[PDB]
Amino acid sequence: PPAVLSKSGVIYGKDVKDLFDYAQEKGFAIPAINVTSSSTVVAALEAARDNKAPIILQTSQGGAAYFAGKGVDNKDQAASIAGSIAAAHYIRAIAPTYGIPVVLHTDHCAKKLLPWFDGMLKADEEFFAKTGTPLFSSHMLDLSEETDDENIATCAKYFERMAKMGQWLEMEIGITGGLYTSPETVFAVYESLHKISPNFSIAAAFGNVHNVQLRPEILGDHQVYAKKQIGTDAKHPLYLVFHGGSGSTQEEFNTAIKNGVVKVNLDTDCQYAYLTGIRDYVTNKIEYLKAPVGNPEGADKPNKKYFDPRVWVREGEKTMSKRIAEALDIFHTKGQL
Amino acid sequence: PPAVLSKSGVIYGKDVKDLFDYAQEKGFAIPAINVTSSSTVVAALEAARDNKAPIILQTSQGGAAYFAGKGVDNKDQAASIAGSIAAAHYIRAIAPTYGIPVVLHTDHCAKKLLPWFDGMLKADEEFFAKTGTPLFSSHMLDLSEETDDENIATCAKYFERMAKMGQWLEMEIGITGGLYTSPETVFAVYESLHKISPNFSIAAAFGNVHQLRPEILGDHQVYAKKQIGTDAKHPLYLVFHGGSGSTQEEFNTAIKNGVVKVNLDTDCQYAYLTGIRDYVTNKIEYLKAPVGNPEGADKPNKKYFDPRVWVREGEKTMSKRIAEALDIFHTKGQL
Ligand SMILES: O=C[C@H](O)COP(=O)(O)O
Ligand SMILES: [Zn+2]
Ligand SMILES: [Zn+2]
User: Fold this and answer.
1) Cα–Cα nearest to B264, from B66, B31, B7, B11
2) Residue B324: which H helix or E strand, with range?
3) DSSP annotation of B284
4) DSSP string covering B18-31
5) Which residues is B232 bridged to in the sheet?
6) Would you say the CB of residue B266 lies under 6 angstroms from ligand 1?
7) How far apart, in whole angstroms, are the C-alpha atoms of residue B35 and residue B51?
């Protein structure tokens, strides 16, 4: 067990790596939950603390923009940069309060959206200039719609800006430049990035879209390739990330983790869960009228105790946390702290 | 006009004062909203911007705790401290990009709740130690239930720790002694606090339990003029608590007498509910995950159940209601 398992709050640099290394070692993966509000942040932080598990909390470009407010325009990425950095502050401030270690990350960033990645890494650098630590734990680039050789050229240039602050980077690659992704194209990315820093993870195409069936076994192939191309004893010389894995079998997850996946993304199954408990507050339908709670007093009995947001929102957090709990069990992440 | 009405973000020290002076000068009160989540902060921060008016975002003891989480133990004020600091930072970071000047306040803190006020203050001064600004812009102390002597004294003791960081202090005073609140007892507050720093606000008891006699605020003002001899018809910064529900002309009489912030909570809580409750209308496309209307049970609810769509409805309704109230307070359009 490294330092991280006993840490509290968001984590950075080597610590991130330790965690992932640990993850591979004991054979669990860590859920990365998308968050859109302080409330949803809480929901997940609480789940992780209640289940003695570390957690990755990420914000997508939309998510980030929501942290900002849906009323700020995004014509130049302003909303996601503002939002993203405010979320990073809030997350940083509260995370320590739960007993666990947290990885603050950002989801899918394509070429089209590179401005956002600029803004965020702008802050990272100046935060590092003040604290000795970046704002976010990691960041992601999704340039899989471009060409493999371009794709890693943009990851490279970025990843050497990033390595100055020991930041982690995750990049996704698919079947385009020069079906599923070849053990070779994976090794190509590791070959061009590992020279810089070891703080990188890969999202490969393997029958998981975000006709084409899921083949987690391919991830094993990616490992046995680099293993041989480096001549290491290391079973898992790659840090692998599972996108769109929602609703798969338990043994699909198994083969993916045993094949060294350390991070599964959860997003829309949490969204539904969040709504689920707040929606069940349609059971206080007539109590959702301003001053008159029909049940006991027609129009002369106040219902501030029914419509206080800290009663019904909380009901939604509870059901979101519960579904995150299910996931911490499934990925063997529960009880590793 | 001073520097404040140009700036964007959260304000501190002298700039908080400048703001309040203008308030009483041009005859408007700035709405103090109680937020409980990034979401509600948005509603407030946006309705302010859209109406080209500044705003006060406040956090109550229970709302602060809600910003940390209802699952974090609060026996020791733990949850209210952490939540406050985290909300502080969030509002700090996001407020800029909304283009308004914002005062970062904490609501009613009673005697038994002083541990909370302690923790915030520690953080405050430790922030000041790194930035030459505190974390929070302003703070509140509700000690009304105590005897008025012990009220003013305890406000003093904290005020001076607080004045070292140019921080503002609001205090509540009632009918406890040591019926409405006397001009004298309010002046006693002034006489005791102006000795440390002029950065202090007063909520006084005038038939607003938590019927209305707003004219009494004036008496508090006339009186104090006498007792210091100054031209100024507004020697005091007064706060209107329990405002949700009074007539427009009550609010008007209250501004006359020099109130510069009107606390709003429960009408926003309902305003925020409204739009989300009105998603009792799409309940058949939000009861499953797949079962849509326009097809048996093989469709995508994802764009209906996404919280980004349905909490935005609520923030909108709350934003509207914040709008109404910043109009009636004649604060809409001072930028
Ligand atoms: O701080 C004072 C409270 O916010 C009063 O407002 P309310 O009348 O909305 O409860
Ligand atoms: Zn992807
Ligand atoms: Zn009060």
Assistant:
1) B31
2) helix B307-328
3) G
4) HHHHHHHHHT--EE
5) none
6) yes
7) 19
Nearest to A34, CA basis, from A70, A66, A59: A59
Q: Of ligand 1's atoms, which has the minimum distance to the CA of residue B265?
A: 9
Q: How close are the terminal C-alpha atoms of chain B, in Å?
A: 10
What tokens were used for A134? 């970046």
Any B CB within 8 A of A74 CB: no
Closest ligand relative to B34 C-alpha: 1
Give φ, ψ of B281 to 5 degrees: -90, -30
Please tell me if residue B67 touches chain A, with a CB cutoff of 8 Å: yes
B106 lines ligand 1 (CB under 6 A): no
In angstroms, the separation between the Cα of residue B318 and the nearest Cα of chain A is 12
Residue carrying structure tokens 């020099």: B258
Q: Are A255 and A222 in contact (CB under 8 A)?
A: no
Q: How far apart are CA B212 and CA B209, in angstroms?
A: 9
* Collapsed DSSP state (helix, strand, coil) of residue B260: strand
Question: Residue whose CA is closest, atom 8 of ligand 1?
Answer: B242
Resolution of this entry, Å: 3.0
Count of CB atoms within 10 A of residue B73's CB? 8
Question: What 3-state DSSP class applies to B317?
Answer: helix
* Helix residue ranges per DSSP H, chain A: 13-26, 38-50, 61-68, 78-94, 114-131, 148-162, 183-193, 217-230, 250-258, 268-279, 294-297, 309-330
DSSP state of B244: T
Instruction: Identify the burial level of A73 via C-beta atoms within 10 angstroms of its C-beta, where 0-12 means exposed, 13-18 middle and 19 or more buried.
Output: exposed
Residue with tokens 């909570």: B265
Residue with tokens 């983790």: A257
Method underlying the structure: X-ray
User: What are the strands, taking DSSP E only, across A3-85?
Assistant: 9-10, 30-34, 55-59
